Amino acid sequence: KVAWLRVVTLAVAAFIFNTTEFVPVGLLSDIAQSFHMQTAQVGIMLTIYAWVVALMSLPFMLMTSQVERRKLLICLFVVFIASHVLSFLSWSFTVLVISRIGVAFANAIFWSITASLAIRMARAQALSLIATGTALAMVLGLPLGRIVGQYFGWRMTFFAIGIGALITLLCLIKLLPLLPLKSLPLLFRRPALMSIYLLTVVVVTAHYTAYSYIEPFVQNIAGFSANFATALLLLLGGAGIIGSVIFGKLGNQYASALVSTAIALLLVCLALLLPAANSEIHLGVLSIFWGIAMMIIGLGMQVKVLALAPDATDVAMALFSGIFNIGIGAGALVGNQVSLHWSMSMIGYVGAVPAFAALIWSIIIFRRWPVT
């Protein structure tokens, strides 16, 4: 009953925390406009947010292992809210980026403890309540947040996100009850696990070289309307939900085959992004594949990480999330460079290189370790 109420207030927080990671992709120009930059330069806020989560997610999780979670959640929420107020009234791109380092700290801690808190209250579908909040962040959180950005501006988008957290924080204060390192070398010494981390960083770099700049790409390269970009992002968000269900149905026994097929499919979408940019329905139909491909890739490797480190899922997850974010920041940076020094239309072809590498690498490591 109220058990459900608290797992539910956890899911709305998941949705809120994931939406703010996502929304900069759909406010890049709006943000660029307010600070007089080209849209690609704004990509630095993505790199910098993702690398701070990466370098901190494993350290943060350890240092906060002895803190009771209700006290922990409140502090991370306070940091989160304060940071979004700071994004709203930020007086320089530098101040905006500094606010984004603040939200990165809260996110890093927040994803440490949120699955554990979901299972503590009654369980398997208590966990799916946290995932569906992520899911909603994808198909609703990012698209709606862009629409708010277009009407009210990007600052109000960040301001609204913090207010929602604040409302969520208060529900958590009423609803929450009292909530009372040596694995790295062993995990390092598992080449099958290390190979998945390697795969993860390469393939995520591939995807985010293009995905980070899809908004300026759609409007300034494909030259479609601002509202076409918003629809594409809902397609991608809904395509991700689609990929999420096929994986959930066949992932436990076809994860390797699913991962490599999805990587092949992602490679193909990257290479055909600029060619498909002349037809709005080609881009829209491409993005449906793109969205399906990338979410199957991400969950397949997450399931490999679990299958390879059941003895230490916490640090393995902290490691997986960390290296996943390194690929996020690398994708934005490479995308940033291809856009500034070459052009944003090669964004699809440059992302294709590492996606190809990752394909071959996936094909190799699944031959070498085929039973999980």
Ligand X SMILES: CCCCCCCCCO[C@@H]1O[C@H](CO)[C@@H](O)[C@H](O)[C@H]1O
Nearer to ligand X, 96 or 323 (CB): 323
Cα dihedral: 345, 350, 351, 352 (round 10): 110
Nearer to ligand X, 96 or 333 (CB): 333
Nearer to ligand X, 17 or 361 (CB): 361
In angstroms, what is the minimal distance from the CB of 254 to ligand X? 24
For residues 12-71, which are near ligand X according to CB under 6 A?
54-55, 58-59
Cα dihedral: 80, 84, 86, 91 (round 10): 150
For residues 270-289, which are near ligand X according to CB under 6 A?
none
- In the three-class reduction of DSSP (H, G, I as helix; E, B as strand; rest coil), residue 65 is classed as coil
Nearer to ligand X, 294 or 330 (CB): 330
Question: Could you write out the DSSP letters of every residue in 293-362?
Answer: HHHHHHHHHHHHHHHH-GGGHHHHHHHHHHHHHHHHHHHHHHHHHIIIII-TTTHHHHHHHHHHHHHHHH
In angstroms, what is the minimal distance from the CB of 56 to ligand X? 7
- Kindly determine how many residues on this chain lie close enough to bind ligand X according to the rule CB under 6 A: 16
Whole-angstrom distance between the N-terminal and C-terminal Cα of the chain?
37
Residues 95-134 as x/- pattern, contact with ligand X by CB under 6 A: ----------------------------------------
Please state, in angstroms and rounded to a whole number, the distance separating the CA atoms of residues 223 and 239: 23
For residues 184-223, which are near ligand X according to CB under 6 A?
194, 197-198, 202, 205
Does 331 bind ligand X (CB under 6 A)? Our answer is no
**Cβ neighbours around 158 below 10 Å, total:** 30
In angstroms, what is the minimal distance from the CB of 94 to ligand X? 24
Please state, in angstroms and rounded to a whole number, the distance separating the CA atoms of residues 133 and 317: 19
**Cβ neighbours around 310 below 10 Å, total:** 9
Please state, in angstroms and rounded to a whole number, the distance separating the CA atoms of residues 128 and 100: 28
Question: What tokens appear for 54 in the block?
Answer: 């990466």
The C-alpha angle 83, 89, 91, rounded to 5 degrees, equals 110
Which residue in 26, 322, 331, 348 binds ligand X (CB under 6 A)? 322
In angstroms, what is the minimal distance from the CB of 221 to ligand X? 23
Which residue in 77, 93, 361, 366 binds ligand X (CB under 6 A)? 361
Nearer to ligand X, 139 or 187 (CB): 187
Nearer to ligand X, 206 or 222 (CB): 206
Nearer to ligand X, 39 or 325 (CB): 325
The widest CA-to-CA distance across the chain, in whole angstroms, is 57
Closest-by-Cβ residue to ligand X is 322
In angstroms, what is the minimal distance from the CB of 50 to ligand X? 12
Which residues of this chain interact with ligand X, rule CB under 6 A?
A: 54-55, 58-59, 194, 197-198, 202, 205, 319, 322-323, 330, 354, 357, 361
